[PDB]
Write an enzyme that holds these catalytic residues in place. Structure first.
Site, PDB file in Angstrom:
ATOM      1  N   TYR A   1       3.312  10.777  -4.171  1.00 16.04           N
ATOM      2  CA  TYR A   1       2.074  11.041  -3.459  1.00 16.04           C
ATOM      3  C   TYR A   1       2.318  11.296  -1.968  1.00 16.04           C
ATOM      4  O   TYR A   1       3.335  10.855  -1.421  1.00 16.04           O
ATOM      5  CB  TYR A   1       1.095   9.849  -3.534  1.00 16.04           C
ATOM      6  N   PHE A  53      -0.074   8.812   8.174  1.00 14.63           N
ATOM      7  CA  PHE A  53       0.419   9.481   6.975  1.00 14.63           C
ATOM      8  C   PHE A  53       1.411   8.589   6.244  1.00 14.63           C
ATOM      9  O   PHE A  53       2.095   7.752   6.852  1.00 14.63           O
ATOM     10  CB  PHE A  53       1.251  10.715   7.269  1.00 14.63           C
ATOM     11  N   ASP A  54       1.522   8.821   4.946  1.00 13.94           N
ATOM     12  CA  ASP A  54       2.427   8.043   4.126  1.00 13.94           C
ATOM     13  C   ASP A  54       2.780   8.912   2.930  1.00 13.94           C
ATOM     14  O   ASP A  54       1.907   9.581   2.394  1.00 13.94           O
ATOM     15  CB  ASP A  54       1.745   6.740   3.707  1.00 13.94           C
ATOM     16  N   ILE A 110      -5.707   0.478  -4.355  1.00 14.93           N
ATOM     17  CA  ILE A 110      -7.135   0.621  -4.066  1.00 14.93           C
ATOM     18  C   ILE A 110      -7.864   1.108  -5.320  1.00 14.93           C
ATOM     19  O   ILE A 110      -7.306   1.809  -6.163  1.00 14.93           O
ATOM     20  CB  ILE A 110      -7.361   1.553  -2.866  1.00 14.93           C
ATOM     21  N   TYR A 139     -10.515   0.770   1.713  1.00 12.80           N
ATOM     22  CA  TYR A 139     -10.347  -0.472   2.414  1.00 12.80           C
ATOM     23  C   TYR A 139     -11.646  -0.992   3.072  1.00 12.80           C
ATOM     24  O   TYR A 139     -11.644  -2.046   3.668  1.00 12.80           O
ATOM     25  CB  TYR A 139      -9.220  -0.318   3.425  1.00 12.80           C
ATOM     26  N   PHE A 141      -5.519  11.790  -0.591  1.00 12.69           N
ATOM     27  CA  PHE A 141      -4.219  11.821  -1.217  1.00 12.69           C
ATOM     28  C   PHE A 141      -3.961  13.072  -2.056  1.00 12.69           C
ATOM     29  O   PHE A 141      -4.860  13.634  -2.729  1.00 12.69           O
ATOM     30  CB  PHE A 141      -4.020  10.671  -2.188  1.00 12.69           C
TER      31      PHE A 141
HETATM   32  C1  LIG Z   1      -2.583  -0.898   3.561  1.00  9.47           C
HETATM   33  O1  LIG Z   1      -1.202  -0.964   3.427  1.00  9.47           O
HETATM   34  C2  LIG Z   1      -0.641   0.217   3.009  1.00  9.47           C
HETATM   35  C3  LIG Z   1      -1.344   1.361   2.668  1.00  9.47           C
HETATM   36  C4  LIG Z   1      -0.640   2.515   2.326  1.00  9.47           C
HETATM   37  C5  LIG Z   1       0.745   2.464   2.220  1.00  9.47           C
HETATM   38  C6  LIG Z   1       1.455   1.325   2.572  1.00  9.47           C
HETATM   39  C7  LIG Z   1       0.737   0.189   2.955  1.00  9.47           C
HETATM   40  O2  LIG Z   1       1.381  -0.948   3.393  1.00  9.47           O
HETATM   41  C8  LIG Z   1       1.720  -1.835   2.305  1.00  9.47           C
HETATM   42  O3  LIG Z   1       2.803   1.161   2.660  1.00  9.47           O
HETATM   43  C9  LIG Z   1       3.688   1.922   1.815  1.00  9.47           C
HETATM   44  C10 LIG Z   1       4.239   1.014   0.728  1.00  9.47           C
HETATM   45  C11 LIG Z   1       5.085  -0.179   1.217  1.00  9.47           C
HETATM   46  O4  LIG Z   1       6.148   0.443   1.923  1.00  9.47           O
HETATM   47  O5  LIG Z   1       3.167   0.554  -0.115  1.00  9.47           O
HETATM   48  C12 LIG Z   1       2.816   1.503  -1.163  1.00  9.47           C
HETATM   49  C13 LIG Z   1       1.668   0.928  -1.910  1.00  9.47           C
HETATM   50  C14 LIG Z   1       0.965  -0.108  -1.507  1.00  9.47           C
HETATM   51  C15 LIG Z   1      -0.236  -0.647  -2.224  1.00  9.47           C
HETATM   52  O6  LIG Z   1      -0.399   0.033  -3.461  1.00  9.47           O
HETATM   53  C16 LIG Z   1      -1.550  -0.452  -1.490  1.00  9.47           C
HETATM   54  C17 LIG Z   1      -1.613  -1.177  -0.151  1.00  9.47           C
HETATM   55  O7  LIG Z   1      -1.738   1.011  -1.191  1.00  9.47           O
HETATM   56  C18 LIG Z   1      -2.717   1.640  -1.857  1.00  9.47           C
HETATM   57  O8  LIG Z   1      -3.424   1.081  -2.656  1.00  9.47           O
HETATM   58  C19 LIG Z   1      -2.770   3.123  -1.543  1.00  9.47           C
HETATM   59  C20 LIG Z   1      -2.545   3.915  -2.839  1.00  9.47           C
HETATM   60  C21 LIG Z   1      -1.120   3.839  -3.294  1.00  9.47           C
HETATM   61  C22 LIG Z   1      -0.221   4.426  -2.198  1.00  9.47           C
HETATM   62  C23 LIG Z   1      -0.407   3.682  -0.835  1.00  9.47           C
HETATM   63  N1  LIG Z   1      -1.859   3.532  -0.437  1.00  9.47           N
HETATM   64  C24 LIG Z   1      -2.353   3.552   0.826  1.00  9.47           C
HETATM   65  O9  LIG Z   1      -3.529   3.223   1.052  1.00  9.47           O
HETATM   66  C25 LIG Z   1      -1.355   3.795   1.942  1.00  9.47           C
HETATM   67  C26 LIG Z   1      -2.042   4.408   3.168  1.00  9.47           C
HETATM   68  C27 LIG Z   1      -1.186   4.534   4.391  1.00  9.47           C
HETATM   69  C28 LIG Z   1      -1.882   5.153   5.557  1.00  9.47           C
HETATM   70  C29 LIG Z   1      -2.450   6.505   5.181  1.00  9.47           C
HETATM   71  C30 LIG Z   1      -3.343   6.350   3.990  1.00  9.47           C
HETATM   72  C31 LIG Z   1      -2.622   5.787   2.823  1.00  9.47           C
END
Ligand SMILES: COc1cc2cc(c1OC)OC[C@@H](CO)OC/C=C/[C@H](O)[C@@H](C)OC(=O)[C@@H]1CCCCN1C(=O)[C@H]2C1CCCCC1
Length: 128
Positions: free
Chosen positions: A45, A55-56, A75, A101, A118
């Site tokens: 993703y 961004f991630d 989420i 969130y 995403f």
């Molecule tokens: C709020 O914290 C984060 C959010 C997001 C990514 C994060 C994160 O820090 C833990 O770090 C990346 C790695 C750890 O290296 O974690 C992946 C999945 C984490 C979990 O599944 C939760 C926290 O993430 C989510 O549910 C969603 C969907 C899966 C992919 C990650 N996503 C995010 O919300 C991203 C976030 C980062 C900033 C831009 C919007 C996406």
């Protein structure tokens, strides 16, 4: 851009029909099956605040992102959206804060009341 295209053409895949999770299939997948709750799911993703401030990407960590569907780990918008996908599909999701969130946010990374975008590729899924 891709987010605005989702606003304009994306399907509302929420049960309440509240536009909180909007989806466009960008590349169609293979076969009839979609993941079920509890399945171990493999994806790539790219995610961002719809405001582009953060961004991630799974690519940044050099490997697929793995989680169990429906099992507390992502989420709400992902539990909802990834469940609709096929093996090899790529989709775009645009997500209101209630399905991400919320008012609380996840500071300092994610502000209060943030809208998320995403791009997801479903690589595989296997039963528990
Ligand atoms: C709020 O914290 C984060 C959010 C997001 C990514 C994060 C994160 O820090 C833990 O770090 C990346 C790695 C750890 O290296 O974690 C992946 C999945 C984490 C979990 O599944 C939760 C926290 O993430 C989510 O549910 C969603 C969907 C899966 C992919 C990650 N996503 C995010 O919300 C991203 C976030 C980062 C900033 C831009 C919007 C996406």
């Amino acid at each position: 851009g891709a987010p605005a295209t989702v606003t304009e053409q994306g399907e509302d895949i929420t049960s309440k029909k509240d536009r909180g999770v909007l989806k466009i299939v960008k590349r169609v997948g293979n076969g009839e099956e979609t993941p079920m709750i509890g399945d171990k799911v493999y994806v790539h993703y790219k995610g961002k605040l719809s405001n582009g401030k953060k961004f991630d990407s799974s690519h940044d960590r050099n490997e697929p992102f793995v989680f169990s569907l429906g099992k507390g780990q992502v989420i709400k918008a992902w539990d909802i959206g990834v469940a609709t996908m096929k093996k090899g599909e790529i989709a775009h999701l645009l997500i209101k804060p209630e399905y991400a969130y919320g008012s609380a946010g996840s500071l300092p990374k994610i502000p209060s009341n943030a809208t998320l975008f995403f791009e997801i590729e479903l690589l595989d899924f296997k039963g528990e």
